[PDB]
């Protein structure tokens, strides 16, 4: 359970996803790896796009130390991921819009250096701003409950 329960709990509790979301995500992660290496740190994006997603939401975790898992581009080389974006997204167009948005986030190195050291309240405010500032992603549910530091 790399990040899967820690960041899925609020999606289940607030009704964004079905209760067995975490298991479906794990199996799809095995088939479709989530790790991705940026010039800085790894940024991972777990997702499924099934019909068990009730509403669209982004759960973001920051890790104390990197977690080593396979790359999105089909490579066994583990990626030392520090930030994980679990995407509770219902369909294709919405997830591509989010991934395009995440790329803009990934490429903002100054943001990431800060992000690794941001408090939950600060993380919420800067991500919240980026989601709503963007012309895209209207309709995604993002709140303080979806911002978490992952112990170890």
């Amino acid at each position, epitope marked *: 359970e790399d990040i899967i329960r820690a960041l899925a709990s609020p999606l289940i509790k607030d009704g964004m996803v079905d209760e067995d979301f975490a298991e479906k995500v794990i199996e799809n992660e095995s088939r479709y790896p989530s790790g*991705l290496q940026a010039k800085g740190v790894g940024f991972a*994006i777990p997702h499924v*796009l*099934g*019909d068990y*997603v009730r509403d669209n939401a982004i759960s973001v975790g920051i890790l104390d130390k990197p977690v080593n898992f396979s790359e*999105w581009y089909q490579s066994p080389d583990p990626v030392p991921v520090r930030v994980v974006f679990m995407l509770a997204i*219902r*369909t*294709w*167009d919405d997830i*591509t*819009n989010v*991934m*395009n948005w*995440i*790329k803009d986030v990934v490429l903002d190195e100054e943001f990431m250096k800060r992000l690794l050291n941001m408090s939950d309240e600060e993380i919420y405010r800067q991500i919240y701003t980026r989601i709503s500032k963007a012309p895209n992603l209207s309709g995604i549910n993002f709140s303080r409950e979806y911002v978490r530091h992952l112990n170890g």
Partner: antibody, heavy 130, light 108 residues
Framework: EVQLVESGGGLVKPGGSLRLSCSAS????????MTWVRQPPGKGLEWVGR??????????DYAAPVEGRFTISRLNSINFLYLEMNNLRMEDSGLYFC??????????????????????WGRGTLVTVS | YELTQETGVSVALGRTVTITCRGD??????ASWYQKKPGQAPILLFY???NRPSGVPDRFSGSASGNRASLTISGAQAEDDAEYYC????????????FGGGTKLTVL
């Protein structure tokens, strides 16, 4: 690995209608994306349309030239899809293929809403007019 | 007619030729490539920036840049004598799909 088989093609008088059918096997038909493409003899492949999965809500996208004359729906319980055509014209004649599609996106170099590929094609069913 | 494709090519046996596709949607999107024989269902040979499907010869692959996409045919054999097709989005950012005209490749 999978099968997809079309049927229901036949001769339609101009202004008439018909419904084509296609069965499928060997895969998850609930989270599948299915499309139709047609090839009039002497022509290339014309995309007709796509039916999406339950995650989106079963929306259907059509090529502009066929919008309003075509409808696509499916029954997942029998792995089968259907499409109805109305007000047919000579340009509607051709071999109608059903195909299973996939999705492609490159996080670093792509652009939303990504791209598509037609991974598995059936033999097709022939529709003629007049 | 969103995607422009050539009528056909004469290919010497065992030689390398390129089948191209041009359009505006190709500046932001990749083209999927297909091989078709008369009487047969078409088969996908290449898609995305670099992805050869399983179940096909590993003889060749495509690529894309600029406003053009292409499939390289290499070591073409008699069994590669086929209609070839390319497909992508109709317009950059749109959700509708298009195919090019179809090119006939013949192997001598």
């Amino acid at each position: 690995e999978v099968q997809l088989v079309e049927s229901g093609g036949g001769l339609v008088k101009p202004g008439g209608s018909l419904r084509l059918s296609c069965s499928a096997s060997g895969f998850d038909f609930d989270n599948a994306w299915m499309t139709w493409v047609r090839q009039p003899p002497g022509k290339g492949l014309e995309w007709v349309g796509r039916i999406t999965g339950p995650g989106e809500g079963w929306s259907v996208d059509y090529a502009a030239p066929v919008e309003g004359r075509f409808t696509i729906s499916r029954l997942n319980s029998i792995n089968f899809l259907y499409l109805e055509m109305n007000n047919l014209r000579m340009e509607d004649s051709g071999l109608y293929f059903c195909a299973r599609t996939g999705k492609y996106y490159d996080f670093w170099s792509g652009y939303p809403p990504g791209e598509e590929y037609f991974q598995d094609w059936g033999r097709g069913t022939l529709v003629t007019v007049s | 007619y969103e995607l422009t494709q050539e009528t056909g090519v004469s290919v010497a046996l065992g030689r390398t030729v390129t089948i191209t596709c041009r359009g505006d949607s190709l500046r932001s999107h990749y083209a999927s490539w297909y091989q078709k024989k008369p009487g047969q269902a078409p088969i996908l040979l290449f898609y995305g920036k670099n992805n050869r499907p399983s179940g096909v010869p590993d003889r060749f692959s495509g690529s894309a840049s600029g406003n053009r996409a292409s499939l390289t045919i290499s070591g073409a054999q008699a069994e590669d004598d086929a209609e070839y097709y390319c497909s992508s989005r109709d317009k950059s950012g749109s959700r509708l799909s298009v195919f090019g005209g179809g090119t006939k490749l013949t192997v001598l």
